[PDB]
RNA sequence: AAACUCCAGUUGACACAAAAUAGACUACGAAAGUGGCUUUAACAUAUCUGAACACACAAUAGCUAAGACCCAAACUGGGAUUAGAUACCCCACUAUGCUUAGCCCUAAACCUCAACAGUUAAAUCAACAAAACUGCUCGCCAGAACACUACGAGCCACAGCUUAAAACUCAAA
C-alpha cells in the first residue's frame, strides 16, 4: 500500500491496468460471471510485489498460471 | 534513617526502640492458624507464658472454629489477657495457612497491642515425613 | 603390585628425580596417587614385557594388555563390592571383548599369542 | 573482504566515529574508511607488521587534522 | 592426593587451641600424610546450633589443614576426627586447588524448539 | 529448629501498617515459592505425578514467554495508518 | 618445573620438628576466603 | 511446535489491537481459534507493567507505600476500556486512602504506561476494586 | 487410542484369577 | 580473475560470546560472602538462573557450594547471613514494599 | 459424626524415616533407574550386527529369616453417606514401604521410534503421531475371538512366571 497510488498512476499513463486493492476470489479463474461472457483477460500481469500483506503469495500468482497468462514479477 | 523492613540483629547496635525495650525484650505473639482452628499464645522474651487463646476456647464449636471471625475473636481475648500483665508491643509468629492466619492478627490489635513485626514460621519439610495420600473428591 | 615408592610414570624419566628430598618423592610415588595411577604403571610394564614395541598402544596387543589391566582391577573392585551389579557387568564384558581380541589375535599371529598368553597369564578357552 | 579486518579494529579501537554516515551520497567516505585508506597505502610501501602499520596509520591522519579519540 | 581438612574446633583459650591442633595435625603424620600449610579462618558464631558429645555449640573456631594423604588415610582419619572431643565438626574434601578450571568462551544460547522437544 | 530466631521470613511493621506489612510477607513467600510449596504438601503427590505436573509448567511457561515475545515484536505496527486510502 | 617448584614448597612444608611454631604461628594470623562480586564481573574484598 | 498450536497461516501478521480496528471490521468476522490467545497474553502483559509501577518507588512515593497489590488484570475485547482489580484493606479507613491515591494516580499512570512503546495505545484504565469482598464491608458501613 | 483391548484382557485375567482362586 | 570478488575469512565483527559475573573465577564453598548473593535473603532459598543470571556451569558450582558449606557449618540454611545483606545485589528480583 | 483429652501451645533435647529451593537445568547409566554432604573404588569395546531359553541385570508389588519403625498405608474395625455402599468422604491400626541376607523376574518395563551406516535430491506424504527415505543385519508378524488360556517342558517360582495351541464360533475384528 506504500506504492497502491505509484503504481496505479503508472498504469494509467503507459494506458494500461493496476489492481492494487484486495484481490477478491476468482476475478481471473471466474471471471465470465463476474464481469460477463465476452470479458477479455489480462495477456500479461506484472507483479512489482508477489506477495499478499501477511507474506504469502499472491493468489494471483497461481491463478494467473491456471489462466495461461504470462507473469512478469519483481 | 531510611526504614528497613529487616529486623534489628541481636548483638548489634540498634537505634530502634519500643516503650524502652529492645527488639530481643518484646514479648512474642505466636499464631497457629490450621485449617481447622487458631490457637493463640502470647509470651515473654523469656519464654514466659502470658495469655491463650484459641477459637476454641472462646465458645465456637466444629467448622465455626475454622472461620476468620473466630480468630478474630480469639484475638481479642488473648490480648485482652495479655495487656493486664503489661503487654502493649508484641512480635506476632504466624505458622499456617488457614483462615485465622490474617485474622488473628487483627484480633491482636483490637485488643489494644501493638505490632513491630510479622514472621512466618510455617513448618516445610526439606524432603520429612510423607504426607496423607490425595482425597478423591 | 608395584611398590608405593615407584614413582609416576609421567615424574619417572624427569631429570635429577633421583636426588630431590625424600618427602618430594613420596609426594610423586604411587603411595600419594589414586589406584588408576597404580594402574597406568602395570600397564606400562605388560607393555615392556610382552610386546615388541612398547610404544604402540593402538596395536591388538596393547589394546589385550590394556583391557587385562581393567579386568584385574574390576576383580579387585567386586572382591569388595560383591553387590555391584554395575561393575559385574562391566567385568563380564570386558572379559567377552579380550576373547574376542584374544580370537582375532590367534587367527593372525599365533606367535605374538602365545607371548601374550603367557606373559599376561590367560588360558585360552575355546567357546561351547 | 581483506579491509574487514582494518574495519574491525578501528571501531574497537576508535568507535564509532561522531561524523555521522550520509548514505545517500554515493561517494561518502567515513573516517573508518580514510583510516582504511591510509592503512592500504603504507602496506604498499612494504610495512607488513600489523600491530606497527594502524599506529603510524593514526599518526599520519592526526598530522592531517582528523580527531582520532580513543574509546578506552 | 592432596586434601582439605576443614576443621571447626570447640571454642577454647589459647592453649587448649593449639594442643587440639598440635593433636589433630600429628593424627595425620601418624596416618602417612605430608601436611602443607594451617590456616586460621578465624572464631566466629556458627550458623545454626551444633551438638557434638554431649555438648551444643553456637561459636566454633574455623581451621584449614592443607595435606597430601594416601587415599586409605581419609577413612582412619574421619574415624580419628569423630573421637576427638574438641572438634565440633570436621570434613576431608578433595582440594579445590587441584581441579583446574577449564576456559569459557561465553554463554552459548541454547535453541527453543530443542527446549519443547527434549 | 538450631537455627536464629526472627531473622527468616520476618518483616518489620512501618507505622502501624500491620496490613501493608502482612502483604509484603505474603509477597515474600509467594515469590520464593513457599506458598505454593505449602499447598502441594498437604498431600502426597506421587512422582509420577509430580512429573507430569514439573513437565507441564515448565511446557507452558515456555509457551507463554514465546507467546508474549510475538506480540511484543507484532505491536511495533499497531502505529495508525500510513496510507489511509490505499 | 613442576618438580623444581614441589621441591621449594617443601621447605614451607609442616613437619614434626616445627609443628609447635607454626601451629601458634597460625593462631595470630587470619587468613579470608570472602568476597563478592558485582554485575560488571569486579571482585569486591572485604574491607580488613 | 507444542500441544498448543501454532500453524496459523497469517502467523506474520501485525498484531494490532486498537480502537480503530475495531469498527473498521467484518460484521460475519468471528475470533479465530487462536485469536484469543493473543487476548489472553496481552491481557497477561498489561499485569505484568502495572504490578511493576506499584511497587517501585520511582513512580510514585504515595503510591509505593500503599503497597497495592493487583488482583486481576483483564483488558476488553472492544479496546475501548482495561479492567484491573485490587484487593482490599480490612479498615474501611485504609481503603478510602487507596482508592482516592490509585483514582488520581491513574491518570498518571496512562502516560506511564505510554513510556512501553510497544504498548502506547493503552484505553484509559478502569481500577475496578475486587477481592476484599468490598460490598461486606460496605454492609458493615450501614 | 482406545483400551476396548485392553479391557477385554483385562476382564478374561480377571476371571482367570477369580476362577483360581476358587479350585 | 577479478579483484573486487568477495574472500572467504571468519566474521572480523564478530562480538565475543556473552559472561556471566562469575566466568573465570573459582567458586569456593568458604567464600560464603559471594555464596549468600544468590540466596534469598528471607528464607534462603537458591536462586534459578533466571534470577542469578550465571550460566549453567557457575549456576551448578554456586549450588553445589552453597549447599557443601551449609551442611559442614560455613553458611545458614532456612536465611541469609545478616553480615551480607548491604552486598552487591546481583539477582534480579525485587522484594520489599 | 466418631476419635483423642497421659490432650494442646511455647522452648529445649532428639532417627536404622524422607531428601524444600537450586531444577525455568536436561545431565548420568545398558535398561531398570539416578536430584542432601563427603571420601574411596569406578562408568567394557581402535569395524558393525548378533539369543524368550546362554551369561549377567531388571521399577512397583510379593515371598523367606532377622531387625528398625517417625510418617504413610492394602486389609480390618469404627463414624457417616446411600434404595444398597463389603466404595467414594472422616478416624484408628496392621501387612508393607526401610536395613540386612536370600528369592521372585513381572509393568502403559512406552520417545508405544530395533541396532549400525548414510542422504535431504526425488514423489513430501493414505491418516494421525514424530518431516521423508536408503543401505545392512537381527528379532518379530500373517482375519477376529477362543487366548496374558489348555497340555507339554523348564524354573528357589507351588493361587506363580516364561514358551504357547486346538476344537466349536463368526463376517467381520
Ligand atoms: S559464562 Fe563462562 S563460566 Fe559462566
Ligand atoms: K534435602
Ligand atoms: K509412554
Ligand atoms: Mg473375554
Ligand atoms: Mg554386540
Ligand atoms: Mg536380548
Ligand atoms: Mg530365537
Ligand atoms: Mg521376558
Ligand atoms: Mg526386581
Ligand atoms: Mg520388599
Ligand atoms: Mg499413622
Ligand atoms: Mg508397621
Ligand atoms: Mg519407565
Ligand atoms: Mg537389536
Ligand atoms: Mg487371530
Ligand atoms: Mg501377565
Ligand atoms: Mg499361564
Ligand atoms: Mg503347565
Same mark, same amino acid.
Given at each position: 500500500?506504500?506504492?497502491?497510488?505509484?503504481?496505479?498512476?503508472?498504469?494509467?499513463?503507459?494506458?494500461?491496468?493496476?489492481?492494487?486493492?484486495?484481490?477478491?476470489?476468482?476475478?481471473?479463474?471466474?471471471?465470465?460471471?463476474?464481469?460477463?461472457?465476452?470479458?477479455?483477460?489480462?495477456?500479461?500481469?506484472?507483479?512489482?510485489?508477489?506477495?499478499?500483506?501477511?507474506?504469502? $503469495?499472491?493468489?494471483?500468482?497461481?491463478?494467473?498460471?491456471?489462466?495461461?497468462?504470462?507473469?512478469?514479477?519483481? | 534513617?531510611?526504614?528497613?523492613?529487616?529486623?534489628?540483629?541481636?548483638?548489634?547496635?540498634?537505634?530502634?526502640?519500643?516503650?524502652?525495650?529492645?527488639?530481643?525484650?518484646?514479648?512474642?505473639?505466636?499464631?497457629?492458624?490450621?485449617?481447622?482452628?487458631?490457637?493463640?499464645?502470647?509470651?515473654?522474651?523469656?519464654?514466659?507464658?502470658?495469655?491463650?487463646?484459641?477459637?476454641?476456647?472462646?465458645?465456637?464449636?466444629?467448622?465455626?472454629?475454622?472461620?476468620?471471625?473466630?480468630?478474630?475473636?480469639?484475638?481479642?481475648?488473648?490480648?485482652?489477657?495479655?495487656?493486664?500483665?503489661?503487654?502493649?508491643?508484641?512480635?506476632?509468629?504466624?505458622?499456617?495457612?488457614?483462615?485465622?492466619?490474617?485474622?488473628?492478627?487483627?484480633?491482636?490489635?483490637?485488643?489494644?497491642?501493638?505490632?513491630?513485626?510479622?514472621?512466618?514460621? @510455617?513448618?516445610?519439610?526439606?524432603?520429612?515425613?510423607?504426607?496423607?495420600?490425595?482425597?478423591?473428591? | 603390585? $608395584?611398590?608405593?615408592?615407584?614413582?609416576?610414570?609421567? *615424574?619417572?624419566?624427569?631429570?635429577?628425580?633421583?636426588?630431590?628430598?625424600?618427602?618430594?618423592?613420596?609426594?610423586?610415588?604411587?603411595?600419594?596417587?589414586?589406584?588408576?595411577?597404580?594402574?597406568?604403571?602395570?600397564?606400562?610394564?605388560?607393555?615392556?614385557?610382552?610386546?615388541?614395541?612398547?610404544?604402540?598402544?593402538?596395536?591388538?596387543?596393547?589394546?589385550?594388555?590394556?583391557?587385562?589391566?581393567?579386568?584385574?582391577?574390576?576383580? %579387585?573392585?567386586?572382591?569388595?563390592?560383591?553387590?555391584?551389579?554395575?561393575?559385574?557387568?562391566?567385568?563380564?564384558?570386558?572379559?567377552?571383548?579380550?576373547?574376542?581380541?584374544?580370537? /582375532?589375535?590367534?587367527?593372525? /599371529?599365533?606367535?605374538?599369542?602365545?607371548?601374550?598368553?603367557?606373559?599376561?597369564?590367560?588360558?585360552?578357552?575355546?567357546?561351547? | 573482504?581483506?579491509?574487514?579486518?582494518?574495519?574491525?579494529?578501528?571501531?574497537?579501537?576508535?568507535?564509532?566515529?561522531?561524523?555521522?554516515?550520509?548514505?545517500?551520497?554515493?561517494?561518502?567516505?567515513?573516517?573508518?574508511?580514510?583510516?582504511?585508506?591510509?592503512?592500504?597505502?603504507?602496506?604498499?610501501?612494504?610495512?607488513?607488521?600489523?600491530?606497527?602499520?594502524?599506529?603510524?596509520?593514526?599518526?599520519?591522519?592526526?598530522?592531517?587534522?582528523?580527531?582520532?579519540?580513543?574509546?578506552? | 592426593?592432596? *586434601?582439605?581438612?576443614?576443621?571447626?574446633?570447640?571454642? !577454647?583459650?589459647?592453649?587448649?587451641?593449639?594442643?587440639?591442633?598440635?593433636?589433630?595435625?600429628?593424627?595425620?603424620?601418624?596416618?602417612?600424610?605430608?601436611?602443607?600449610?594451617?590456616?586460621?579462618?578465624?572464631?566466629?558464631?556458627?550458623?545454626?546450633?551444633?551438638?557434638?558429645?554431649?555438648?551444643?555449640?553456637?561459636?566454633?573456631?574455623?581451621?584449614?589443614?592443607?595435606?597430601?594423604?594416601?587415599?586409605?588415610?581419609?577413612?582412619? !582419619?574421619?574415624?580419628?576426627?569423630?573421637?576427638?572431643?574438641?572438634?565440633?565438626?570436621?570434613?576431608?574434601?578433595?582440594?579445590?586447588?587441584?581441579?583446574?578450571?577449564?576456559?569459557?568462551?561465553?554463554?552459548?544460547?541454547? $535453541?527453543?524448539?530443542?527446549?519443547?522437544?527434549? | 529448629?538450631?537455627?536464629?530466631?526472627?531473622?527468616?521470613?520476618?518483616?518489620?511493621?512501618?507505622?502501624?501498617?500491620?496490613?501493608?506489612?502482612?502483604?509484603?510477607?505474603?509477597?515474600?513467600?509467594?515469590?520464593?515459592?513457599?506458598?505454593?510449596?505449602?499447598?502441594?504438601?498437604?498431600? *502426597?503427590?506421587?512422582?509420577?505425578?509430580?512429573?507430569?505436573?514439573?513437565?507441564?509448567?515448565?511446557?507452558?511457561?515456555?509457551?507463554?514467554?514465546?507467546?508474549?515475545?510475538?506480540?511484543?515484536?507484532?505491536?511495533?505496527?499497531?502505529?495508525?495508518?500510513?496510507?489511509?486510502?490505499? | 618445573?613442576?618438580?623444581?617448584?614441589?621441591?621449594?614448597?617443601?621447605?614451607?612444608?609442616? @613437619?614434626?620438628?616445627?609443628?609447635?611454631?607454626?601451629?601458634?604461628?597460625?593462631?595470630?594470623?587470619?587468613?579470608?576466603?570472602?568476597?563478592?562480586? @558485582?554485575?560488571?564481573?569486579?571482585?569486591?574484598?572485604?574491607?580488613? | 511446535?507444542?500441544?498448543?498450536?501454532?500453524?496459523?497461516?497469517?502467523?506474520?501478521?501485525?498484531?494490532?489491537?486498537?480502537?480503530?480496528?475495531?469498527?473498521?471490521?467484518?460484521?460475519?468476522?468471528?475470533?479465530?481459534?487462536?485469536?484469543?490467545?493473543?487476548?489472553?497474553?496481552?491481557?497477561?502483559?498489561?499485569?505484568?507493567?502495572?504490578?511493576?509501577?506499584?511497587?517501585?518507588?520511582?513512580?510514585?512515593?504515595?503510591?509505593?507505600?500503599?503497597?497495592?497489590?493487583?488482583?486481576?488484570?483483564?483488558?476488553?475485547?472492544?479496546?475501548?476500556?482495561?479492567?484491573? *482489580?485490587?484487593?482490599?484493606?480490612?479498615?474501611?479507613?485504609?481503603?478510602?486512602?487507596?482508592?482516592?491515591?490509585?483514582?488520581?494516580?491513574?491518570?498518571?499512570?496512562?502516560?506511564?504506561?505510554?513510556?512501553?512503546?510497544?504498548?502506547?495505545?493503552?484505553?484509559?484504565?478502569?481500577?475496578?476494586?475486587?477481592?476484599?469482598?468490598?460490598?461486606?464491608?460496605?454492609?458493615?458501613?450501614? | 487410542?482406545?483400551?476396548?483391548?485392553?479391557?477385554?484382557?483385562?476382564?478374561?485375567?480377571?476371571?482367570?484369577?477369580?476362577?483360581?482362586?476358587? @479350585? | 580473475?577479478?579483484?573486487?570478488?568477495?574472500?572467504? !575469512? %571468519? /566474521?572480523?565483527?564478530?562480538?565475543?560470546?556473552?559472561?556471566?559475573?562469575?566466568?573465570?573465577?573459582?567458586?569456593?564453598?568458604?567464600?560464603?560472602?559471594?555464596?549468600?548473593?544468590?540466596?534469598? $535473603?528471607?528464607?534462603?532459598?537458591?536462586?534459578?538462573?533466571?534470577?542469578?543470571?550465571?550460566?549453567?556451569?557457575?549456576?551448578?558450582?554456586?549450588?553445589?557450594?552453597?549447599?557443601?558449606?551449609?551442611?559442614?557449618?560455613?553458611?545458614?540454611?532456612?536465611?541469609?547471613?545478616?553480615?551480607?545483606?548491604?552486598?552487591?545485589?546481583?539477582?534480579?528480583?525485587?522484594?520489599?514494599?
Amino acid at each position: 500500500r506504500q506504492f497502491s497510488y505509484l503504481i496505479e498512476n503508472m498504469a494509467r499513463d503507459c494506458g494500461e491496468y493496476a489492481h492494487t486493492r484486495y484481490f477478491r476470489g476468482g476475478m481471473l479463474t471466474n471471471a465470465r460471471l463476474l464481469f460477463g461472457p465476452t470479458v477479455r483477460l489480462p495477456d500479461l500481469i506484472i507483479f512489482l510485489h508477489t506477495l499478499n500483506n501477511i507474506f504469502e $503469495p499472491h493468489v494471483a500468482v497461481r491463478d494467473a498460471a491456471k489462466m495461461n497468462i504470462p507473469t512478469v514479477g519483481i | 534513617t531510611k526504614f528497613s523492613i529487616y529486623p534489628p540483629i541481636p548483638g548489634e547496635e540498634s537505634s530502634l526502640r519500643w516503650a524502652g525495650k529492645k527488639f530481643e525484650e518484646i514479648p512474642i505473639a505466636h499464631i497457629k492458624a490450621s485449617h481447622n482452628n487458631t490457637q493463640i499464645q502470647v509470651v515473654s522474651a523469656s519464654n514466659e507464658p502470658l495469655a491463650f487463646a484459641s477459637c476454641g476456647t472462646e465458645g465456637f464449636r466444629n467448622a465455626k472454629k475454622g472461620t476468620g471471625i473466630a480468630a478474630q475473636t480469639a484475638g481479642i481475648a488473648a490480648a485482652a489477657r495479655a495487656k493486664q500483665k503489661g503487654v502493649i508491643h508484641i512480635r506476632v509468629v504466624v505458622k499456617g495457612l488457614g483462615p485465622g492466619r490474617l485474622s488473628a492478627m487483627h484480633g491482636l490489635i483490637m485488643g489494644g497491642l501493638e505490632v513491630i513485626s510479622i514472621t512466618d514460621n @510455617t513448618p516445610i519439610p526439606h524432603x520429612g515425613c510423607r504426607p496423607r495420600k490425595a482425597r478423591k473428591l | 603390585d $608395584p611398590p608405593p615408592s615407584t614413582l609416576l610414570k609421567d *615424574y619417572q624419566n624427569v631429570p635429577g628425580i633421583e636426588k630431590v628430598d625424600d618427602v618430594v618423592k613420596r609426594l610423586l610415588s604411587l603411595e600419594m596417587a589414586n589406584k588408576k595411577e597404580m594402574l597406568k604403571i602395570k600397564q606400562e610394564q605388560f607393555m615392556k614385557k610382552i610386546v615388541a614395541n612398547p610404544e604402540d598402544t593402538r596395536s591388538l596387543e596393547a589394546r589385550i594388555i590394556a583391557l587385562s589391566v581393567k579386568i584385574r582391577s574390576y576383580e %579387585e573392585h567386586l572382591e569388595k563390592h560383591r553387590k555391584d551389579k554395575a561393575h559385574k557387568r562391566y567385568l563380564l564384558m570386558s572379559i567377552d571383548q579380550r576373547k574376542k581380541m584374544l580370537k /582375532n589375535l590367534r587367527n593372525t /599371529n599365533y606367535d605374538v599369542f602365545e607371548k601374550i598368553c603367557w606373559g599376561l597369564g590367560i588360558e585360552y578357552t575355546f567357546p561351547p | 573482504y581483506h579491509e574487514d579486518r582494518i574495519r574491525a579494529k578501528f571501531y574497537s579501537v576508535y568507535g564509532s566515529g561522531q561524523r555521522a554516515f550520509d548514505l545517500f551520497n554515493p561517494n561518502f567516505k567515513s573516517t573508518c574508511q580514510r583510516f582504511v585508506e591510509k592503512y592500504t597505502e603504507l602496506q604498499k610501501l612494504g610495512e607488513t607488521d600489523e600491530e606497527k602499520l594502524f599506529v603510524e596509520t593514526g599518526k599520519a591522519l592526526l598530522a592531517e587534522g582528523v580527531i582520532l579519540r580513543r574509546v578506552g | 592426593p592432596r *586434601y582439605e581438612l576443614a576443621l571447626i574446633l570447640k571454642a !577454647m583459650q589459647r592453649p587448649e587451641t593449639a594442643a587440639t591442633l598440635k593433636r589433630t595435625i600429628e593424627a595425620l603424620m601418624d596416618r602417612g600424610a605430608i601436611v602443607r600449610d594451617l590456616e586460621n579462618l578465624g572464631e566466629r558464631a556458627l550458623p545454626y546450633r551444633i551438638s557434638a558429645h554431649s555438648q551444643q555449640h553456637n561459636r566454633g573456631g574455623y581451621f584449614l589443614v592443607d595435606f597430601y594423604a594416601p587415599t586409605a588415610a581419609v577413612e582412619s !582419619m574421619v574415624e580419628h576426627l569423630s573421637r576427638d572431643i574438641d572438634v565440633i565438626r570436621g570434613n576431608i574434601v578433595k582440594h579445590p586447588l587441584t581441579q583446574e578450571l577449564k576456559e569459557c568462551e561465553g554463554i552459548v544460547p541454547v $535453541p527453543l524448539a530443542e527446549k519443547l522437544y527434549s | 529448629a538450631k537455627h536464629l530466631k526472627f531473622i527468616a521470613r520476618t518483616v518489620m511493621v512501618q507505622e502501624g501498617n500491620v496490613e501493608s506489612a502482612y502483604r509484603t510477607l505474603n509477597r515474600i513467600l509467594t515469590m520464593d515459592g513457599l506458598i505454593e510449596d505449602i499447598k502441594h504438601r498437604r498431600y *502426597y503427590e506421587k512422582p509420577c505425578r509430580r512429573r507430569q505436573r514439573e513437565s507441564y509448567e515448565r511446557c507452558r511457561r515456555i509457551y507463554n514467554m514465546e507467546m508474549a515475545r510475538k506480540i511484543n515484536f507484532l505491536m511495533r505496527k499497531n502505529r495508525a495508518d500510513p496510507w489511509q486510502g490505499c | 618445573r613442576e618438580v623444581l617448584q614441589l621441591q621449594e614448597e617443601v621447605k614451607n612444608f609442616i @613437619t614434626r620438628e616445627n609443628l609447635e611454631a607454626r601451629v601458634e604461628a597460625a593462631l595470630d594470623s587470619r587468613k579470608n576466603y570472602n568476597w563478592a562480586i @558485582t554485575r560488571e564481573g569486579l571482585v569486591v574484598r572485604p574491607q580488613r | 511446535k507444542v500441544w498448543y498450536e501454532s500453524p496459523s497461516l497469517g502467523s506474520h501478521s501485525t498484531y494490532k489491537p486498537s480502537k480503530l480496528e475495531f469498527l473498521m471490521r467484518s460484521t460475519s468476522k468471528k475470533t479465530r481459534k487462536e485469536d484469543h490467545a493473543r487476548l489472553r497474553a496481552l491481557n497477561g502483559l498489561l499485569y505484568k507493567a502495572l504490578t511493576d509501577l506499584l511497587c517501585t518507588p520511582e513512580v510514585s512515593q504515595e503510591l509505593y507505600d500503599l503497597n497495592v497489590e493487583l488482583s486481576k488484570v483483564s483488558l476488553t475485547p472492544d479496546f475501548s476500556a482495561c479492567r484491573a *482489580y485490587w484487593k482490599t484493606t480490612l479498615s474501611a479507613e485504609q481503603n478510602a486512602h487507596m482508592e482516592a491515591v490509585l483514582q488520581r494516580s491513574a491518570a498518571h499512570m496512562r502516560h506511564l504506561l505510554m513510556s512501553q512503546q510497544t504498548l502506547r495505545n493503552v484505553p484509559p484504565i478502569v481500577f475496578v476494586q475486587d477481592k476484599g469482598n468490598a460490598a461486606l464491608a460496605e454492609l458493615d458501613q450501614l | 487410542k482406545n483400551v476396548l483391548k485392553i479391557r477385554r484382557r483385562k476382564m478374561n485375567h480377571h476371571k482367570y484369577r477369580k476362577l483360581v482362586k476358587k @479350585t | 580473475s577479478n579483484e573486487d570478488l568477495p574472500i572467504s !575469512m %571468519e /566474521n572480523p565483527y564478530k562480538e565475543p560470546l556473552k559472561k556471566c559475573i562469575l566466568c573465570g573465577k573459582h567458586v569456593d564453598y568458604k567464600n560464603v560472602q559471594l555464596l549468600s548473593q544468590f540466596v534469598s $535473603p528471607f528464607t534462603g532459598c537458591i536462586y534459578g538462573r533466571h534470577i542469578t543470571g550465571l550460566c549453567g556451569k557457575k549456576q551448578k558450582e554456586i549450588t553445589k557450594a552453597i549447599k557443601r558449606a551449609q551442611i559442614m557449618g560455613f553458611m545458614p540454611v532456612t536465611y541469609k547471613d545478616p553480615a551480607y545483606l548491604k552486598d552487591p545485589k546481583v539477582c534480579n528480583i525485587r522484594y520489599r514494599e
